Amino acid sequence: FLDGIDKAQEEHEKYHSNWRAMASDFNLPPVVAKEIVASCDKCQLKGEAMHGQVDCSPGIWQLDCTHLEGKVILVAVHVASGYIEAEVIPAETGQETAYFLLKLAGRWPVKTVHTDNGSNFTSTTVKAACWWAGIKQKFSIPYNPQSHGVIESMNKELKKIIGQVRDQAEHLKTAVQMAVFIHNFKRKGGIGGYSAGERIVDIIATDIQTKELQKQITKIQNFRVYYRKGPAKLLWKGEGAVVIQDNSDIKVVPRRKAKII
Amino acid sequence: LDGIDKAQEEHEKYHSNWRAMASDFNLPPVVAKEIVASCDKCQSPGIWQLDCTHLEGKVILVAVHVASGYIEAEVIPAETGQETAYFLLKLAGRWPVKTVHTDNGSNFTSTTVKAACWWAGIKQKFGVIESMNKELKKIIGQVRDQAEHLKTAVQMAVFIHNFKRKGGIGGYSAGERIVDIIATDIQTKELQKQITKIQNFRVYYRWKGPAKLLWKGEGAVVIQDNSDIKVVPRRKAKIIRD
Amino acid sequence: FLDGIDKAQEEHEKYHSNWRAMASDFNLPPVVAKEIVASCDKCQLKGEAMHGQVDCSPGIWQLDCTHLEGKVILVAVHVASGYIEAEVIPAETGQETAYFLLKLAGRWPVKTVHTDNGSNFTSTTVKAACWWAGIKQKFSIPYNPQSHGVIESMNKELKKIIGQVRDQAEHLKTAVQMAVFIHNFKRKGGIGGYSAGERIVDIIATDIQTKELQKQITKIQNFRVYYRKGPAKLLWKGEGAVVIQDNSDIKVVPRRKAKII
Amino acid sequence: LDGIDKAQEEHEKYHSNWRAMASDFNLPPVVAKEIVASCDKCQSPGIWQLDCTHLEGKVILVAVHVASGYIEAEVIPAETGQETAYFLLKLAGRWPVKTVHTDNGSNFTSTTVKAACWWAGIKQKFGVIESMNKELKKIIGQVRDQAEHLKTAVQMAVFIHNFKRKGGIGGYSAGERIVDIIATDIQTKELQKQITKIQNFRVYYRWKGPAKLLWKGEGAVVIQDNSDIKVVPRRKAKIIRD
Amino acid sequence: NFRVYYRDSRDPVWKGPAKLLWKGEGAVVIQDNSDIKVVPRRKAKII
Amino acid sequence: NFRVYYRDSRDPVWKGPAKLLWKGEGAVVIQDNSDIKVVPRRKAKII
Amino acid sequence: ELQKQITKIQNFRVYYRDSRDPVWKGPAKLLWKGEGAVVIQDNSDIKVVPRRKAKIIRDYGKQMAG
Amino acid sequence: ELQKQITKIQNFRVYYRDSRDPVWKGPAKLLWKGEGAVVIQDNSDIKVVPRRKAKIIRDYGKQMAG
DNA sequence: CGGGAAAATCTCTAGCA
DNA sequence: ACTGCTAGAGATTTTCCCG
DNA sequence: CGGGAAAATCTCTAGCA
DNA sequence: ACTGCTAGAGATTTTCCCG
Ligand SMILES: C[C@@H]1CCO[C@H]2Cn3cc(C(=O)NCc4ccc(F)cc4F)c(=O)c(O)c3C(=O)N12
Ligand SMILES: C[C@@H]1CCO[C@H]2Cn3cc(C(=O)NCc4ccc(F)cc4F)c(=O)c(O)c3C(=O)N12
Ligand SMILES: [Mg+2]
Ligand SMILES: [Mg+2]
Ligand SMILES: [Mg+2]
Ligand SMILES: [Mg+2]
Ligand SMILES: [Zn+2]
Ligand SMILES: [Zn+2]
């Protein structure tokens, strides 16, 4: 193909013909033609067609601002549960946000907050508040809202509920509180058929309780395991398989070729 | 299924509530509830207390969840009905709130507070609150130097009280305690909904008289007839809605 | 449920609780609770999760404008083939568009044009031109670009190619012509592994040729069919099935219970 | 497969091209092409003509596709190289254009036109065009009253010429004709690409000498050995790339 | 009969109930206070 | 090694080739003329 | 005569979509062509398709290939 | 003693996702819980899941129901 | 074992701006 | 070294319930 | 009939603004 | 009475090719 290749590259300079047009018009194997494309900096224009997944741990909260009738609403969602929390604030500042965040930290276990890079969120007073409450801060990749898609979506749902009830209240601060009520207690769905309020209760209580139980289990159940290696620590056994933890690495091995000591 | 008699004996001996009879003897909670409800001898999550305290000439509204000791507090600018109403609606959106106990002050009796309670479905009923205002003030005094404004100090105190202080039997914080209590309440109302859902049926087994339904498992049908709980196969009985 | 219903409706007035929350909290059958929602005008907020499909007939062209370095590019695509046609125009007017459209009508069979409602497209001079060329005009539902998604997508692809070749030319009009070249002849894919240029040739030639052949077939093959009815006209037979056309309705019946006369 | 001998006889008798031998006797077009290329006795889509005409003091550039009679024409403001170049690049993007025949005027020989031809891969080579300018002028005269500006009249004439005028053998318009011709050219170059792709292999059958490959079907392998086309089963032969 | 609720013309506010006149694939014709509208089925709900 | 091409920060212009430093799920750390960037995998291409 | 024309008809490939499915259904045989509908055979299954939903080609590559 | 605690562990349901699939995988049994990983049993298939990808509940409705 | 109806699950969409 | 998501509408499959 | 490699097909995404 | 689409990246399944 030493002839077809030289021609295809020359034509690809002018035209940037994709790999099929070059395979067709120069009798080239697909891999060779595709190689011509892969080596053109001017033809690297499309990102891979996937989505990432956000952290759903019981301690992570996603925060954002949103805007309605010329007012700033600060919103937060426990990602695991869908449970929200919003207040109208006078201004999009680190002072309002640090105060909102201190309140939230005192009402629920807040381990990590994830936000976009709005200046209220990167301010120094929010840093000082998160430091004081023991909150780890995560900022998304700039201009990638998908990173905190949960809270962006919750902005959608909170504004829709506010629309449903705007007229029962006079001031937006009241409609906003009504809407948080409605979301957290009058809307069931998701994993347990729960309302978000019930679901966050279950998540946090389960977290506490499983922690306690597994603690007691590790206190009593104490063995060493050998498979294929070293003295791996036993985590779980049964049903013809043994789950071990060897050098901070959890692997599921069958009961065969595994002896518990 | 086979442990219903063991559970009946355990209840006759020790008067154990349904939770234990269903955790130990592996029974559907409706059945253990029926056993504990068939003996005559064997016979809070939503109640909050609100009060307005004063510090450094500013006004703090304080909500205590009585069962737990868990506080929601803040500085409000003025001791008015509008502000109490807004605080209450916030709390109701955040926690299941059924009853509020206040002290007949001007704000807690306002029309606006009563409107908020009617909207949120809260019942207004006009000792723990005094001692708890005291505790909160002690913590505010401990952390006052750590901020410039009283409102931030208040929120820090609330954080400290709810999560950084452990006492009582199991050395739990108020936040852990309230989460436990509310989870227990959710289990309780799931159970009551289950009881309500199935209390409308009537069963006929082997055909005998009409028996009350308790459970419709995958391999049996647990009923109750003449204050006796009998397990019959599904194919051998017929359940109808009355 | 006469009690639960009355309560659920009252609560749904305040809260607009969804059907699951009402089934849960009032012991209601799903259909009853859902009925409460379906009857609330304030809870009709979401459209059905589907997409329509555009007309792909060999005669339909989709037209649009687009904008690049402060200049107006008029674009057209034969929907069936993907084959495009673009010119920089001095202004977004019905005069430019009627002239562009007359040219396109004289180069290809243009039976129908589909556009958004930009004023250049609804102008009276474009109407007069389409009338003179025998072009039927279709306008999408206003502010629904999806209706002419093909041409909107082609705006995307034309601008990307222009970016790839902008520097080989000096004026945008030239880069635009280069980009139309590239799209129509140096990019293969789609149904026949074709370039759009080859594909439109095949579509239009096939259309002509199948028309001629089926015409001759209907001229020779002349029969009447009875099935189950009236004297239905035969279209195709074979493989134990007969395709008939009864009262402008084409139905495929098996060979059994069907006699050809 | 079985009709290769019938096709060979048909070609020896009538010298029929490969299209007929492959449409009538059901052969892969490579095989019919080999048959029509194995007999010594039996031995345009891209060419356009450009010219600049004049009407009412304005300038019209005219492209005729020679094989078809199909016109692309417009009013250009000035008879320059830049404008010719832009018209040519437009045509090249719209139709497969390989060769342009012009009349050595100032514009058709400009550097800018030559740059456009080099970019588009067109070959410049310096009777139909005169008669066709005439026809186009007649139609422009017929439709002049139907518009205000000459450019619109020109485009109407082009529409009329390409699609509203039918003549010749089958009474086709120029647009139908050009679409046919270009489709035929596409078939031809698909076939040439196929021939090129398979002309690099060598076959060994039953092992006999190296034979030239013609087709690799699903149930056979058609080869050519000693100017003879033999059909062998796939399992009985071995194809290698040389 | 059918009640139609719809969003139309860039207005993020759902309206209705409108009478359904015609249902295609992808769009509906509805009537809303003597005002016949054409709405994409993505942007309507028929009840 | 790997060449990374990417779009970042609201700029619709693809840049690169950058050196890949780290690949997670959903994002990459790349280096581009001594400038370490973090890019969503939706917005990058690794070669 | 007639059989040749019919076998020509059946040489054209049909790409089509069903009323709700956005994927284009792979190449099917053309049996009959109307002003509003093309009759196809797709995997031993004769179907009727509105014309606005069908792309009818020859597939020149496949044809020349055989 | 130990068996009661282990059977309590196995009463909690796990909702989880795999590294690339956006659908939440239906309720699985909890076998073991770590700081970084929960060990599950989903349809007779023991799997390890990063903690950031798992929602662990009790399903109070199901529990009370039995 | 068989249908019908009901419940559950799957598929897909806008808006978050 | 980090990352789309939610909830509703409607379609499709599983489940259950009296024979 | 069996793997490996190659081709084909399927899944999913941004941008059209 | 009208209506999302395209093309590229990467994963997954089908096909083919020498044993
Ligand atoms: C100046 C701060 C910091 C830097 O950037 C700006 C601009 N911005 C833009 C969007 C936005 O485009 N949402 C639409 C969206 C698109 C896709 C998706 F997956 C989720 C989505 F919400 C936001 O939501 C948002 O909060 C902000 C903001 O705060 N800022
Ligand atoms: C004044 C004229 C007439 C009336 O409306 C405006 C505004 N408009 C807006 C878009 C636009 O929003 N494209 C984004 C997009 C979104 C979804 C999808 F499926 C396809 C898409 F292209 C156009 O493309 C467009 O041509 C126009 C236009 O011409 N006008
Ligand atoms: Mg933001
Ligand atoms: Mg936001
Ligand atoms: Mg437009
Ligand atoms: Mg547009
Ligand atoms: Zn390139
Ligand atoms: Zn409602």
Author numbering:
A (entry chain G), C (entry chain A): 1 to 228, 236 to 268
B (entry chain H), D (entry chain B): 2 to 44, 57 to 139, 149 to 228, 235 to 270
E (entry chain D), F (entry chain J): 222 to 268
G (entry chain C), H (entry chain I): 212 to 277
From the paper:
HIV-1 and other retroviruses integrate a DNA copy of their viral RNA genome into the genome of the host cell, a process that is mediated by the virally encoded enzyme integrase (IN). Each step of DNA integration, up to formation of the integration intermediate, occurs within a series of stable nucleoprotein complexes (intasomes), involving a multimer of IN and a pair of viral DNA ends. Because integration is an essential step in viral replication, intasomes are targeted by an important class of antiretroviral drugs, the IN strand transfer inhibitors (INSTIs). INSTIs work by chelating the two Mg2+ ions, blocking the active site and inhibiting the strand transfer activity of IN.
Here, we determined structures of the HIV-1 intasomes E138K/G140A/Q148R and E138K/G140S/Q148H, with DTG bound, resolved to 2.5 and 2.2 Å, respectively. The Q148R mutation causes a weakening of the chelation by DTG, which, when combined with other mutations, also weakens the binding of the drug. In contrast to the two structures described above, the side chain of His is shorter in the E138K/G140S/Q148H intasome, and accordingly, the His side chain is also furthest from the Mg2+ ions. To compare the distinct systems used to examine how INSTIs bind to intasomes, we next compared the structure of the E138K/G140S/Q148H HIV-1 intasome with DTG bound to the structure of G140S/Q148H SIVrcm intasome with BIC bound, which was solved previously. If the E138K mutation is present in the HIV-1 intasome, the side chain of H114 rotates toward the S140/H148 pair, inducing an alternate rotamer in S140 compared the SIVrcm intasome. This causes the Nε2 atom of H114 to approach closer to the Nδ1 atom of H148 by 1.0 Å in the HIV-1 intasome. The repositioning of H114 strongly implicates this residue in the resistance mechanism through its interaction with H148, which would facilitate proton transfer to stabilize the buildup of positive charge around the Mg2+ ions. The His-mediated polarization of Mg2+ ions is expected to be weakest, and its effect on the binding of INSTIs is also expected to be less. Our data, generated using multiple experimental systems to measure inhibitory potencies, fitness, enzyme activity, and atomic structure, help to explain why S140 appears to arise in conjunction with Q148H, whereas both A140 and S140 can arise in conjunction with Q148K/R. In the case of the double mutant G140S/Q148H, based on structure, S140 directly interacts with H148 via the polar hydroxyl group of Ser and the Nδ1 atom of His. The compensatory effect appears to be caused by S140 forming hydrogen bonds with both H148 and T115, which creates a favorable energetic environment around the active site when the mutation Q148H is present in conjunction with G140S.
